Scaffold this active site. Structure first.
Site, PDB file in Angstrom:
ATOM      1  N   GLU A  13       0.830  -1.191   0.000  1.00 44.58           N
ATOM      2  CA  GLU A  13       0.000   0.000   0.000  1.00 44.58           C
ATOM      3  C   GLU A  13       0.865   1.240   0.000  1.00 44.58           C
ATOM      4  N   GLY A  14       0.381   2.242  -0.716  1.00 47.77           N
ATOM      5  CA  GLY A  14       0.965   3.571  -0.814  1.00 47.77           C
ATOM      6  C   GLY A  14      -0.096   4.580  -0.430  1.00 47.77           C
ATOM      7  N   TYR A  16      -1.285   7.116  -2.390  1.00 49.70           N
ATOM      8  CA  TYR A  16      -2.117   7.308  -3.581  1.00 49.70           C
ATOM      9  C   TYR A  16      -3.034   6.125  -3.887  1.00 49.70           C
ATOM     10  N   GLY A  17      -2.537   4.919  -3.646  1.00 49.41           N
ATOM     11  CA  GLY A  17      -3.269   3.685  -3.891  1.00 49.41           C
ATOM     12  C   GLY A  17      -2.460   2.447  -3.580  1.00 49.41           C
ATOM     13  N   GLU A  18      -2.652   1.405  -4.385  1.00 56.59           N
ATOM     14  CA  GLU A  18      -1.977   0.128  -4.196  1.00 56.59           C
ATOM     15  C   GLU A  18      -0.914  -0.204  -5.252  1.00 56.59           C
ATOM     16  CE  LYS A  34       3.600   4.899  -6.674  1.00 54.70           C
ATOM     17  NZ  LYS A  34       4.881   5.582  -6.404  1.00 54.70           N
ATOM     18  CG  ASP A 117      10.762   8.989   1.433  1.00 56.71           C
ATOM     19  OD1 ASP A 117      11.299   9.126   2.565  1.00 56.71           O
ATOM     20  OD2 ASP A 117       9.641   8.495   1.277  1.00 56.71           O
TER      21      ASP A 117
HETATM   22  C1  LIG Z   1       7.644  -9.720  -2.926  1.00 50.07           C
HETATM   23  O1  LIG Z   1       7.696  -8.540  -3.764  1.00 50.07           O
HETATM   24  C2  LIG Z   1       7.295  -7.389  -3.217  1.00 50.07           C
HETATM   25  O2  LIG Z   1       6.876  -7.283  -2.092  1.00 50.07           O
HETATM   26  C3  LIG Z   1       7.422  -6.254  -4.170  1.00 50.07           C
HETATM   27  C4  LIG Z   1       8.124  -6.401  -5.363  1.00 50.07           C
HETATM   28  N1  LIG Z   1       8.259  -5.441  -6.279  1.00 50.07           N
HETATM   29  C5  LIG Z   1       7.689  -4.263  -6.028  1.00 50.07           C
HETATM   30  N2  LIG Z   1       7.893  -3.318  -7.004  1.00 50.07           N
HETATM   31  C6  LIG Z   1       7.722  -1.956  -6.975  1.00 50.07           C
HETATM   32  C7  LIG Z   1       8.320  -1.156  -7.956  1.00 50.07           C
HETATM   33  N3  LIG Z   1       8.175   0.173  -7.963  1.00 50.07           N
HETATM   34  C8  LIG Z   1       7.425   0.700  -6.978  1.00 50.07           C
HETATM   35  C9  LIG Z   1       7.243   2.137  -6.978  1.00 50.07           C
HETATM   36  N4  LIG Z   1       7.079   3.263  -6.957  1.00 50.07           N
HETATM   37  C10 LIG Z   1       6.836  -0.098  -6.009  1.00 50.07           C
HETATM   38  N5  LIG Z   1       6.984  -1.423  -6.006  1.00 50.07           N
HETATM   39  C11 LIG Z   1       6.958  -4.008  -4.868  1.00 50.07           C
HETATM   40  C12 LIG Z   1       6.807  -5.013  -3.917  1.00 50.07           C
HETATM   41  N6  LIG Z   1       6.075  -4.789  -2.777  1.00 50.07           N
HETATM   42  C13 LIG Z   1       5.387  -3.539  -2.499  1.00 50.07           C
HETATM   43  C14 LIG Z   1       6.062  -2.605  -1.519  1.00 50.07           C
HETATM   44  C15 LIG Z   1       7.319  -1.952  -2.070  1.00 50.07           C
HETATM   45  N7  LIG Z   1       7.803  -0.922  -1.150  1.00 50.07           N
HETATM   46  C16 LIG Z   1       6.763   0.065  -0.828  1.00 50.07           C
HETATM   47  C17 LIG Z   1       5.506  -0.610  -0.341  1.00 50.07           C
HETATM   48  O3  LIG Z   1       5.069  -1.607  -1.279  1.00 50.07           O
END
Ligand SMILES: COC(=O)c1cnc(Nc2cnc(C#N)cn2)cc1NC[C@H]1CNCCO1
Ligand SMILES: COC(=O)c1cnc(Nc2cnc(C#N)cn2)cc1NC[C@H]1CNCCO1
EC number: 2.7.11.1
Length: 258
Positions: A13-14, A16-18, A34, A117
């Site tokens: 979760e972010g 702005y959204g998911e 995203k 950040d």
């Molecule tokens: C097991 O793989 C995961 O958990 C995982 C992999 N790849 C991601 N890729 C990207 C690429 N770019 C962005 C942007 N902006 C965001 N997530 C995100 C992933 N999890 C989400 C997390 C990431 N940290 C912030 C909170 O949510």
């Protein structure tokens, strides 16, 4: 059918959204989508990026109010989940991740981009545990046509923000990203953040300025990495160590093995 993608699960979760995991119907290739309901700037900055330690950008699509960003799926997840609370991680792992983080930051700074950040939640790991800098939502251009522009907007995450952002009207972008990298290094080596924020009113920040390294989390850190941290976590951004200098540091160059 190569343009058809299935949504498998919600990765995170972010604001702005998911962030959702999408898998291609034909190739089984995975992408992190995203979803955002500025965003134009994040897209523009992402189109600029091409580095092995930066999350790949595949493209984007706008549907009504909803905006989709197609990004690298980093199957190893966040660096955040590799840090054991109150412990950290083995020093050779922390050094390898630090080397990768410096390579990604050098690249961004090289193109005149500042992340603003840097934290373990934003440092993702691919299938081979290679670190990738992620989320350019707060990123900005600090150098254009070889002219540096000073920053003034308050952003980032307080445990990781440099002290000049809280005390000065304007500040150089590069020492701010250097400082957050130092905090990330502290977290990897001690499994804890040294202070709530780097202000005069913060006791833990005062203790560090008074060199009380017999206290946690510093007492958990070996003298060599600690000597690098002393160089990075310098209050004056003009006296703070630069990345070229970090690359010459004794611990940065120390051969380490499990
Ligand atoms: C097991 O793989 C995961 O958990 C995982 C992999 N790849 C991601 N890729 C990207 C690429 N770019 C962005 C942007 N902006 C965001 N997530 C995100 C992933 N999890 C989400 C997390 C990431 N940290 C912030 C909170 O949510
Ligand atoms: C290279 C170009 N364009 C892409 N486009 C899209 C479009 N939609 C999704 C979804 N869901 C994912 N990737 C993906 C790419 N490589 C993966």
């Amino acid at each position: 059918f190569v343009e058809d993608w299935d949504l498998v699960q919600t990765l995170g979760e972010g604001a702005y959204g998911e962030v959702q995991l999408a898998v291609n119907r034909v190739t089984e290739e995975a992408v992190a989508v995203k979803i955002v309901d500025n965003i134009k700037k994040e897209i523009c900055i992402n189109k600029m990026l091409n580095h092995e330690n930066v999350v790949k950008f595949y493209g984007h699509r706008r549907e009504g109010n909803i905006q989709y960003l197609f990004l690298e799926y980093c199957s190893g997840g966040e660096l955040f989940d590799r840090i054991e609370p109150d412990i950290g991680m083995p020093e050779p792992d922390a050094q390898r991740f630090f080397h990768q983080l410096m390579a990604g930051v050098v690249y961004l700074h090289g193109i005149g981009i500042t992340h603003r950040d840097i934290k373990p939640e934003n440092l993702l790991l691919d299938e081979r545990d290679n670190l990738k800098i992620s989320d350019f939502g707060l990123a900005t251009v600090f150098r254009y046509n070889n002219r540096e522009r000073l920053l003034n907007k308050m952003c980032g995450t307080l445990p990781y923000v440099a002290p000049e952002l809280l005390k000065r009207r304007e500040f150089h972008a590069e020492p701010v990203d250097v400082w957050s990298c130092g905090i990330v290094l502290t977290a990897m080596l001690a499994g804890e953040l040294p202070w709530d924020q780097p202000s005069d009113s913060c006791q833990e920040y005062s203790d560090w300025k008074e060199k009380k390294t017999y206290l946690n989390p510093w007492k958990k850190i070996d003298s060599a990495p600690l000597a690098l941290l002393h160089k990075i976590l310098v209050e004056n951004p003009s006296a703070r160590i630069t990345i070229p200098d970090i690359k010459k540091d004794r611990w940065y160059n120390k051969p380490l093995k499990k």
